[PDB]
Amino acid sequence: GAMNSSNYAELFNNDIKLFVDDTNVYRVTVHKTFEGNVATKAINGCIFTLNPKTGHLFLKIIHTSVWAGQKRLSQLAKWKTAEEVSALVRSLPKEEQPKQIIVTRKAMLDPLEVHMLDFPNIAIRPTELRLPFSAAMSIDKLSDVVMKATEPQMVLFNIYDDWLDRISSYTAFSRLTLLLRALKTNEESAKMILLSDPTITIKSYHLWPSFTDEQWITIESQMRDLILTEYGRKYNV
Amino acid sequence: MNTVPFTSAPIEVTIGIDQYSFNVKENQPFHGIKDIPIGHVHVIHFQHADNSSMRYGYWFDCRMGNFYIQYDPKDGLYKMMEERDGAKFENIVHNFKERQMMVSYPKIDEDDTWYNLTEFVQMDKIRKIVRKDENQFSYVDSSMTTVQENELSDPAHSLNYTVINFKSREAIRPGHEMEDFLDKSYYLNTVMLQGIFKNSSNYFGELQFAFLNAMFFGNYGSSLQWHAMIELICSSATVPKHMLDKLDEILYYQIKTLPEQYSDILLNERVWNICLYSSFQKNSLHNTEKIMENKYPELL
Ligand SMILES: NCc1nccn1Cc1ccccc1
């Protein structure tokens, strides 16, 4: 069924599953034509496909050429997403294919279901959680590789860096969703917290800074404050 | 004009013949139904006064034999049977007519309702949906399930309607996923019309039969099937012009004939609102849209 607060630990059991987020697949900058009308210009996007247990991100970059001469792009984007996720599954060895795919937006259910008809035993599930994966394009290295793509391209990242050496998947997912929730509510302040201290660096092969355990607690604290704060700056509480 | 005589009426029952019905009292001297128009299938059906549970009945065509009804006190229902002895039957019927113990199929001459509801329904196709080849007539009741319902339990008692499923490999060409899901013309015209039904007449006959079993017996799986066959046409961008015109006539008489007090259960909000107002054929069902609006503007 749908995934929610009640069945949250299922994400970290030993059944392979993937989250699929399509919020950054079709991206535009709406602008004004010389005639004073409004046009969109697309920019490169990405499918955000994440194994929450292992941290394996399959980042499929969506090059703007895929929209050329197409109609109803917001609708096409869902079907393109589903086509790419199905292609990814077919590319994996059987023992690596997921048992479940959890879509973060319900409008992806029928497109993914139809593309995966060849996979009757892969459950396609929605979720009641309001997950912050849209903010993946606030991670500088991910934004950078998407904008620079000149052709369709799959890029493979561990979104947990090396955290699983020291913490559980449950804990790593919680840290990830706190960081992304912070970037989503106030990107500027969030990035200030992460890069404030010039002594902490981001490894060439990582996405986030190399914090000690103690610094992670301080960071995590600072991120919660921001999220409450911005909840007060928006709601005046 | 043909006749379906009754041995007797030992239990109190409401008896229907097509869209007509009358109340027979316990052991009232009822001995059947005469003047039945030749050239159409017909359905005789029953709702016992005591247990309104189980509406049931028999589809038949008087050209294919002489049929009568006789109550069975063991199985507790009015059964249709075939009489193989022609002179026995005509004599039964003649004697029963002589004593005027039969009701007359009460057709208004101006009225084409039954023809219009059964235009494409043939007994040969009914007998394939309802399997029991030892009888020339077909039993249906409120509780019988469809093949597709049993997939999601007694096969001998199933309604073998054609399975329609919009998220199925039969419906969706590999590589045309979005195209075929949003425009079902492939599935309508190639898979179903050309492949399965062979022509639109056979498609319309199943659609009409499914409606009639939904209306007369409250058969839920039949209602599902009727709506699916409507949705598949309305959701195709490319439909033969003659089918679209005929569909409007078909649906018009079904909605016209539906009990006003049954539209809460037998009509699917989503299907009708999509079919009349959002689909490719939203503008090709003028008469059906017109009568749905003057008669069931609530559902919409
Ligand atoms: N090959 C880049 C990489 N970086 C860390 C792990 N990996 C492998 C991997 C496999 C599938 C998805 C994501 C990551």
From Swiss-Prot, chain A:
It is found in: Nucleus. Changing R105K: Severely impaired growth. Reduced growth at 30 degrees Celsius. Strongly reduced growth at 16 degrees Celsius. Residues 7-237 are annotated as: RNase H homology domain. Changing D22A: Reduced growth at 30 degrees Celsius. Strongly reduced growth at 16 degrees Celsius. Strongly reduced growth at 35 degrees Celsius. It comes from the Eukaryota. Component of the U4/U6-U5 tri-snRNP complex composed of the U4, U6 and U5 snRNAs and at least PRP3, PRP4, PRP6, PRP8, PRP18, PRP31, PRP38, SNU13, SNU23, SNU66, SNU114, SPP381, SMB1, SMD1, SMD2, SMD3, SMX2, SMX3, LSM2, LSM3, LSM4, LSM5, LSM6, LSM7, LSM8, BRR2 and DIB1. Present with 468 molecules/cell in log phase SD medium. Functions as a scaffold that mediates the ordered assembly of spliceosomal proteins and snRNAs. Required for association of BRR2 with the spliceosomal U5 snRNP, and the subsequent assembly of the U4/U6-U5 tri-snRNP complex. Functions as a scaffold that positions spliceosomal U2, U5 and U6 snRNAs at splice sites on pre-mRNA substrates, so that splicing can occur. Interacts with both the 5' and the 3' splice site, as well as the branch region. Has a role in branch site-3' splice site selection. Associates with the branch site-3' splice 3'-exon region. Also has a role in cell cycle. The MPN (JAB/Mov34) domain has structural similarity with deubiquitinating enzymes, but lacks the residues that would bind the catalytic metal ion. This is Pre-mRNA-splicing factor 8. The lineage of its organism: Eukaryota, Fungi, Dikarya, Ascomycota, Saccharomycotina. The gene is PRP8. The chain holds residues 1836 to 2069 of 2413 of the full protein.
Swiss-Prot record, chain B:
GO terms for cellular component: cytoplasm; U5 snRNP. Residues 244-265 are annotated as: Leucine-zipper. It is found in: Cytoplasm; Nucleus. It comes from the Eukaryota. InterPro entries: AAR2, AAR2_C, AAR2_C_sf, Aar2_N, AAR2_N_sf. The modification Phosphoserine is found at S236. One of its GO terms (biological process) is spliceosomal snRNP assembly. Keywords: Cytoplasm, mRNA processing, mRNA splicing, Nucleus, Phosphoprotein. The keyword Cytoplasm applies. It holds the Pfam family AAR2_1st. Heterodimer. Interacts with PRP8 (via RNase H homology domain and MPN domain), competing with BRR2 for the same binding site. Component of a U5 snRNP complex that contains at least the U5 snRNA, PRP8, SNU114, AAR2, SMB1, SMD1, SMD2, SMD3, SME1, SMX2 and SMX3, but is not a component of the U4/U6-U5 tri-snRNP complex. Belongs to the AAR2 family. Component of the U5 snRNP complex that is required for spliceosome assembly and for pre-mRNA splicing. Involved in splicing pre-mRNA of the A1 cistron and other genes that are important for cell growth. This is A1 cistron-splicing factor AAR2. The gene is AAR2.
